[PDB]
Design a binder for this molecule. Sequence first.
Ligand SMILES: *[C@@H](O)[C@H](C[C@@H]1CCNC1=O)NC(=O)[C@H](CC(C)C)NC(=O)OCC(C)(C)Sc1ccc(F)cc1
Ligand SMILES: *[C@@H](O)[C@H](C[C@@H]1CCNC1=O)NC(=O)[C@H](CC(C)C)NC(=O)OCC(C)(C)Sc1ccc(F)cc1
Lengths: 302, 302
Amino acid sequence: HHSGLVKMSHPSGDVEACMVQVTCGSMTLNGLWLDNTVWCPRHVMCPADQLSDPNYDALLISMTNHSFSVQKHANLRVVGHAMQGTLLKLTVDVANPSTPAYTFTTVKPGAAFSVLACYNGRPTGTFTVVMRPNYTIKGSFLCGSCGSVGYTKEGSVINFCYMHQMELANGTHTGSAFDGTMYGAFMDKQVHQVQLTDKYCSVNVVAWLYAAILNGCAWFVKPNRTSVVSFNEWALANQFTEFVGTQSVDMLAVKTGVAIEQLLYAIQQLYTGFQGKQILGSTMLEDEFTPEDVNMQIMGVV
Amino acid sequence: HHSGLVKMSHPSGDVEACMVQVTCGSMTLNGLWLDNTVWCPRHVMCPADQLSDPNYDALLISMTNHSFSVQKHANLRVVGHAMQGTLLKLTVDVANPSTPAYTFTTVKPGAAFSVLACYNGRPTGTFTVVMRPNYTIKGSFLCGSCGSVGYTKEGSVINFCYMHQMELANGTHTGSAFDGTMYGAFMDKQVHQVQLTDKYCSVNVVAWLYAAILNGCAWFVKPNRTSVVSFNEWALANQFTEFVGTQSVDMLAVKTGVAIEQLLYAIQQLYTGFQGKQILGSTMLEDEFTPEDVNMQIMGVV
Ligand SMILES: *[C@@H](O)[C@H](C[C@@H]1CCNC1=O)NC(=O)[C@H](CC(C)C)NC(=O)OCC(C)(C)Sc1ccc(F)cc1
Ligand SMILES: *[C@@H](O)[C@H](C[C@@H]1CCNC1=O)NC(=O)[C@H](CC(C)C)NC(=O)OCC(C)(C)Sc1ccc(F)cc1
C-alpha cells in the first residue's frame, strides 16, 4: 500500500522569472531579481586563487557599479552595489515586471522548503529539502549552482529563505538567509569547517508515524505513552531533536485518534529496532516529511 | 555521506501557463491548453451517479460545444469537441500565447517524468515519479487532481506523457498518454480493477549501485560477474525486470570502472539480504533513480 506522500515542491514559475545570471569577472553564478534589487552570493567577486580565505571587505571596495554583469535568459545595468553578510545587494535601473508578492524569512530545523536549482541564470530543476538540525540540507548541487534560491509559499506570497553557498565534506549543502547570515556556524570560505551533529527530527517522525495510521499501518501503536518532557530527556542522549508540538500535529492526533505521547513511546522502541517489520515500506524512521506535508498530501488540509 | 541525489523535478513554469479549469456540469477538473486545443480526462462529462460504468460514447453525443466551460486563473469558449481514447479534444477560439515547443510521447517502465499537480486549474505542487512495471505511479493525488499532466523535458521541448485519471486500491495512481490510451490494462471506470505485479527495475537499481561507487560506497562490488542473459533468467523468478543496457548505463560503467555484469551479480546477492550493511543510508535496493538521474545530478552529464 503506497502512502500517498511524495517529495512535493512548490510550483516554481514565479521564482523562475526572478532568476538572473551574475558575472563578476572570471566567475559566474545565479542571482535573485526582485524589484530593482539583485541578490547573489558575495563570493562571485572572489578570484579563483583567493577562494580559501577571501577578504570580502577589500574585494567589495575594489568593485565598481559597471563591473557587475547581470543577464537574464535581457542585460541589466547595475546602478548600486552593497554587501550584507554573505550576500550582495546589487541595485539595477530596471525593476522586475514579474516580481511576485514576497517576504524574507528564516527557515528552522525540521521545516521544509522548495529549491530552484539554476546554472548560468537558467533554472534546471526543483526539489524540496528539510533543514537539518546541523543547519545543512541534503540537496543536489554542482559547480555554478550558487545563487539557487530556497523558498516557501504561503498563499500567493513567496517567502525566500535560502541561497545556496557551499557543499560540505559529507556531501550535504548549506547556504544563507536573505539577511546575510549563513545557516549554522558555517562561513563562506573554501576550507574544511566543523559540522555539527545531525539528529532525527522528532516532530517530523511523529508526522510520518501519523501518516502510517492514515494508511492503515498501526502495528506500532500501543496504549503505552511517553510524556513530552520524558521523551525530550530521552532525545538528548539518543541524537533526537526535542519534540515541540504544533497545531498541525494536533490535527493528525485528533483525526487518527492516537495521542502524540503514544507515538513518542513508539519512537523510543522503534529506535531500538523495527524487529523485522516495516512502516510505509521502510525499516527506518523518516524525518523528511513535515506535519504540514502529511496534512496537505493525505487529507488536503493546508 | 550524502549521495547528492534528490527527487529532481523539471521546472514547471512552461507547463503552468498551459493549465486551465474544465467544467462539464457538476464536476470540474484540470485541462492542458496547447494552441487551440484543450485536453482533459473524458470522465468530466460523467454524472456522479454514473461513475462506475459510464457510457462515454452516449455522453459525448449528449454534449454541446457551449456546454464545456474552460477557465484559466480568462474564460475560454469551446468551438469544437472530440474524443480520443480516455481523453477529450476540446477546440477553443483562442490559442495559448504561452504555448511551448512540445511533443507527445509514451513513457516506459523504469523511466522518470515530472508531474504538475493541479486543482481547479491552479497548479499546487510538482514532483517526479518513475513509471512502475505494472504501469502505475506512486504519486500524491487527491479528489479533483485529474487533468494534472506528467511530462519530460528534452532541451526546450516538453514531451507530455501522462494525464492523471484514477487512484488504485493500493494507493498508487495511473493515467493515460495523450493518444487516449491509459497505461497498462486499466480502464477509466470507478470499479476495482486487477492490478499487475510490481517489479524492481534492474536498470534503475544498477544506476543506484553505480551512484554508490561515485560516492565512495563500493563494499558490495566483487570481481564476480553475472551475464545479462543469466541475470534476466534469474530476474524472471524474483520479481525483477529484465535488464536492458543503455548508453547512459555505459557512461557510469566507464567512469566508475565497474562492469555492469559485476553489479548484476551484486544485485542477486544484495536481494538475499544486505547482511546488516547499508548503501546510501538504505538497507534496500532503490529503483527510483534512473541512469540519467545519476548522470545529471552527480557528474553533470545530460
Ligand atoms: C557555488 O558556486 C558552489 C556550490 C558547490 C560546488 C560543488 N557543489 C556545490 O554545492 N560553491 C562553491 O564553489 C564554494 C565557494 C566557497 C567560497 C564557499 N566552495 C565550496 O564550498 O566548495 C565545496 C567544498 C567541498 C570544496 S568545501 C571544502 C570541504 C572540505 C575541505 F577540506 C575543503 C573545502
Ligand atoms: C480525478 O478526478 C480523480 C483522482 C483520484 C481521486 C482520489 N485520488 C485520486 O488520485 N479520479 C477519480 O475520481 C476516478 C474517476 C473514475 C471515473 C476513473 N475515480 C477513481 O479511480 O477513484 C479512486 C478509487 C480508489 C475509488 S477506484 C476504486 C478502487 C477499488 C474499488 F473497489 C472501487 C473503486
